[PDB]
């Protein structure tokens, strides 16, 4: 989103904050959320995929 | 058919085990820890 | 005539046993493999929750 | 952390209950018998 | 590299599980084929 320009507005909707790469820092909270969500989905998907093969 | 499957399983697992033994032998090293310790002291 | 009818009987007996063979395929591959795969799961929610 | 890596590998027993696994024979065996049902009688014998 | 080796060992465990499943299927099919061989003699 910030590619090609030094600073650009915040990509989120209704946000006008002009940001750059240095303005963004690693978010441990988002990694935690996505990690947890993906692991839950992975457990669900492994069970679903196994039964998804049991169908064939 | 099941005996053929068993033979294929055995061959594939033998090959995999050889490769895994090689990779385990390749898993020696652990880096910047020594340099950090030296700089600290 | 008797020999001809006997040959026909043997052909139809082999046909019926091929049918029984397909029935055996049903019983083992259709069901025994189905049961083995169904129980092999042991509801993986088991090992997952372990 | 080491056990974290191990348990991630155990989640990759995704293939552990997914890849190893029922009805492929079941669907076809029906077709095998249905086709062979028309083929075939003990009363005739 | 140790993580990669452990991943490979997990693949080894999956292969061994496949081997064991094949062994169980082979044994069951041996029992069934022996049974049907016995039956065929039961059923010039």
Swiss-Prot record, chain A:
Residues that, per the record, bind Zn(2+): 10, 15
Transmembrane region(s): none
Subcellular localization: Nucleus; Cytoplasm
Similarity comment: family membership: Belongs to the NSE2 family.
Record function comment: Acts as an E3 ligase mediating SUMO/Smt3 attachment to SMC5 and YKU70. Acts in a DNA repair pathway for removal of UV-induced DNA damage that is distinct from classical nucleotide excision repair and in repair of ionizing radiation damage. Functions in homologous recombination repair of DNA double strand breaks and in recovery of stalled replication forks.
Miscellaneous section: Present with 2800 molecules/cell in log phase SD medium.
Quaternary context: Component of the Smc5-Smc6 complex which consists of KRE29, NSE1, NSE2/MMS21, NSE3, NSE4, NSE5, SMC5 and SMC6.
Protein name according to UniProt: E3 SUMO-protein ligase MMS21
Originating organism: Saccharomyces cerevisiae (strain ATCC 204508 / S288c) (Baker's yeast)
Gene of this entry: MMS21
Residues of the full protein shown: 212 to 267 of 267
Swiss-Prot record, chain C:
Record localization: Nucleus; Chromosome
Superkingdom field: Eukaryota
Post-translational modification: Sumoylated by MMS21.
Entry's transmembrane regions: none
Family affiliation: Belongs to the SMC family. SMC5 subfamily.
Domain note: The flexible hinge domain, which separates the large intramolecular coiled coil regions, allows the heterotypic interaction with the corresponding domain of smc6, forming a V-shaped heterodimer.
Assembly behavior: Component of the Smc5-Smc6 complex which consists of KRE29, MMS21, NSE1, NSE3, NSE4, NSE5, SMC5 and SMC6.
Note: Present with 892 molecules/cell in log phase SD medium.
UniProt function note: Acts in a DNA repair pathway for removal of UV-induced DNA damage that is distinct from classical nucleotide excision repair and in repair of ionizing radiation damage. Functions in homologous recombination repair of DNA double strand breaks and in recovery of stalled replication forks.
Protein name: Structural maintenance of chromosomes protein 5
Residues of the full protein shown: 697 to 746 of 1093
From Swiss-Prot, chain D:
Post-translational modification: Sumoylated by MMS21.
Subcellular compartments: Nucleus; Chromosome
Signal peptide per UniProt: none
Lineage: superkingdom: Eukaryota
Subunit and interaction comment: Component of the Smc5-Smc6 complex which consists of KRE29, MMS21, NSE1, NSE3, NSE4, NSE5, SMC5 and SMC6.
Protein family according to the UniProt entry: Belongs to the SMC family. SMC5 subfamily.
Miscellaneous comment: Present with 892 molecules/cell in log phase SD medium.
Record note on domains: The flexible hinge domain, which separates the large intramolecular coiled coil regions, allows the heterotypic interaction with the corresponding domain of smc6, forming a V-shaped heterodimer.
Function: Acts in a DNA repair pathway for removal of UV-induced DNA damage that is distinct from classical nucleotide excision repair and in repair of ionizing radiation damage. Functions in homologous recombination repair of DNA double strand breaks and in recovery of stalled replication forks.
Protein name: Structural maintenance of chromosomes protein 5
Annotated organism of origin: Saccharomyces cerevisiae (strain ATCC 204508 / S288c) (Baker's yeast)
Species classification: Eukaryota, Fungi, Dikarya, Ascomycota, Saccharomycotina
Curated annotation (Swiss-Prot), chain E:
UniProt subcellular location: Nucleus; Chromosome
The family this protein is said to belong to: Belongs to the SMC family. SMC6 subfamily.
Its job: Acts in a DNA repair pathway for removal of UV-induced DNA damage that is distinct from classical nucleotide excision repair and in repair of ionizing radiation damage. Functions in homologous recombination repair of DNA double strand breaks and in recovery of stalled replication forks. Probably plays a role in structure.
Record's miscellaneous remark: Present with 339 molecules/cell in log phase SD medium.
Notes concerning its domains: The flexible hinge domain, which separates the large intramolecular coiled coil regions, allows the heterotypic interaction with the corresponding domain of SMC5, forming a V-shaped heterodimer.
Record's subunit section: Component of the Smc5-Smc6 complex which consists of KRE29, MMS21, NSE1, NSE3, NSE4, NSE5, SMC5 and SMC6.
Protein name as annotated: Structural maintenance of chromosomes protein 6
Organism: Saccharomyces cerevisiae (strain ATCC 204508 / S288c) (Baker's yeast)
């Amino acid at each position: 989103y910030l590619q090609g320009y030094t600073t650009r507005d915040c990509p989120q909707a209704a946000c006008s904050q002009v940001v750059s790469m240095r303005d963004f820092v690693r978010d441990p909270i988002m990694e935690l959320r996505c990690k947890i969500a993906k692991m839950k989905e992975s457990q669900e998907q492994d069970k679903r995929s196994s039964q998804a093969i049991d169908v064939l | 058919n099941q005996e053929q499957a068993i033979a294929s399983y055995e061959a594939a697992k033998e090959e995999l085990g050889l490769k895994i033994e090689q990779i385990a032998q390749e898993a020696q090293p652990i880096l910047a820890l020594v340099e950090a310790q030296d700089e600290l002291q | 005539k008797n020999d001809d009818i006997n040959r026909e009987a043997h052909q139809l007996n082999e046909i019926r046993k091929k049918y029984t063979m397909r029935k055996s395929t049903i019983e083992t591959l259709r069901e025994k493999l189905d049961q083995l795969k169904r129980e092999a799961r042991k509801d993986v929610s088991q090992k997952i929750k372990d | 952390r080491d056990e974290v890596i191990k348990k991630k590998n155990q989640n990759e027993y995704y293939r552990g209950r997914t890849k190893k696994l029922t009805i492929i024979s079941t669907k076809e065996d029906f077709l095998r018998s249905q086709e062979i049902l028309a083929q075939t009688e003990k009363s005739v014998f | 590299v140790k993580s990669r080796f452990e991943k490979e060992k997990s693949n080894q465990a999956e292969a061994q599980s496949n081997i064991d499943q094949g062994r169980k299927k082979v044994d069951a099919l041996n029992k069934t084929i022996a049974h049907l061989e016995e039956e065929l003699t039961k059923e010039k």
